[PDB]
């Protein structure tokens, strides 16, 4: 059925509501999606009651306990093809004397315009509160925030921080309360806010290869798309066994594209397809890694091609 694993774990607070959509791509996002717990068995119940149930193609952890931490699998069985995806998900309770646990605190890789710009991440599927996103209550270092519009302001899923003669360093929490079946549970995120801004401390960000493993067979051939989001002067290039793809390599080929962003120059995308005429037993030994430089940093991500199981 061809497996694909997402090596990155998505840590989230326990005793809350949580969703987990299928990290899918273009040519694969087709009919039929199915979820399971560690290993293959009977799929997570669609029974709308039950704590852990699937609904609208997503995996819903209603009270999301700690004993739910692990690997979940997502399957796409169209008719001719099927795709199983391993994801890894951790649920953590807050450290003693804190309204949060360090493991679940996010950090933005690419900033937005303004002295603030905090965006409560992962609320998209909760926007389902009758089409509009529920009123977000905000915090800083665990203490409540008054959205009076002179110190801070609340708009949709964002939190604008006003330019006061203040230290903004802190661990901000966004809080919503979803109502499901005549009872509501909390939803929280924590984003760490810094000082790096104004000039251009923005290094390129590789969105495509997301530290994952793909299962392919020796005979066949593939194509690996590296997608970056940065300025048109940044650079996206693939490497293997600690070396850039040879400009005259027989099996491997590297094409560099660029998609300009009219809306925002600073945030355009760069594609670098690494073609592979034929998979070889030497490629199963190391991971393929995309790279992106800009003199303000370097970002790197990978995809590990592994031999199909017994």
């Amino acid at each position: 059925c061809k497996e694909r694993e997402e090596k990155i774990i998505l840590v989230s607070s326990a005793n809350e509501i949580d969703v987990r959509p299928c990290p899918l791509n273009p040519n694969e996002h087709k009919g039929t999606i199915t979820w399971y717990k560690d290993d293959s068995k009977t799929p997570v119940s669609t029974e709308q009651a039950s704590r852990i149930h699937q609904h609208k193609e997503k995996l819903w952890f209603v009270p999301a306990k700690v004993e739910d931490s692990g690997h979940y699998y997502c399957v796409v069985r169209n008719s001719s093809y099927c795709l199983r995806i391993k994801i890894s998900a951790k649920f953590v309770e807050n450290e003693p004397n804190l309204c949060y646990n360090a493991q679940a605190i996010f950090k933005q890789k690419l900033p937005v315009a303004g002295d603030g710009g905090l965006v409560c991440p992962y609320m998209e599927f909760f926007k389902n509160e009758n089409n509009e996103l529920p009123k977000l209550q905000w915090y800083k270092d665990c203490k409540p925030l008054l959205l009076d519009n002179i110190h801070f302001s609340g708009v949709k899923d964002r939190l604008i921080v006003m330019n006061v003669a203040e230290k903004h360093r802190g661990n901000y929490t966004c809080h919503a309360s979803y109502t499901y079946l005549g009872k509501q549970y909390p939803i929280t995120r924590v984003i760490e806010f810094i000082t790096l801004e104004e000039n251009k401390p923005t290094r390129p960000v590789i969105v495509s290869p997301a530290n994952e493993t793909m299962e392919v067979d020796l005979g066949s051939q593939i194509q690996l798309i590296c997608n970056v989001t940065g300025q048109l002067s940044d650079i996206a290039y693939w490497k293997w066994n600690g070396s850039v793809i040879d400009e005259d390599d027989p099996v491997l080929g590297e094409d560099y594209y660029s998609v300009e962003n009219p809306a925002n120059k600073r945030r355009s995308t760069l594609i670098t397809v690494l073609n592979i005429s034929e998979i070889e037993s030497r490629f199963y030994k190391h991971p393929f890694t995309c790279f992106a430089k800009n003199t303000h940093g370097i970002d790197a991500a990978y995809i590990q091609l592994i031999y199909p199981v017994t």
Binding site: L10, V11, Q103, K107, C120, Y122, E124, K156, T229
Partner: peptide, 21 residues
């Protein structure tokens, strides 16, 4: 308004303090 999506949250966010399973 163009509110953040999940694909967008994955793309432009990461957990530096997160630990393995």
């Amino acid at each position: 308004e163009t509110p953040f999506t999940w694909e967008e949250s994955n793309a432009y966010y990461w957990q530096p303090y997160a630990l393995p399973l």
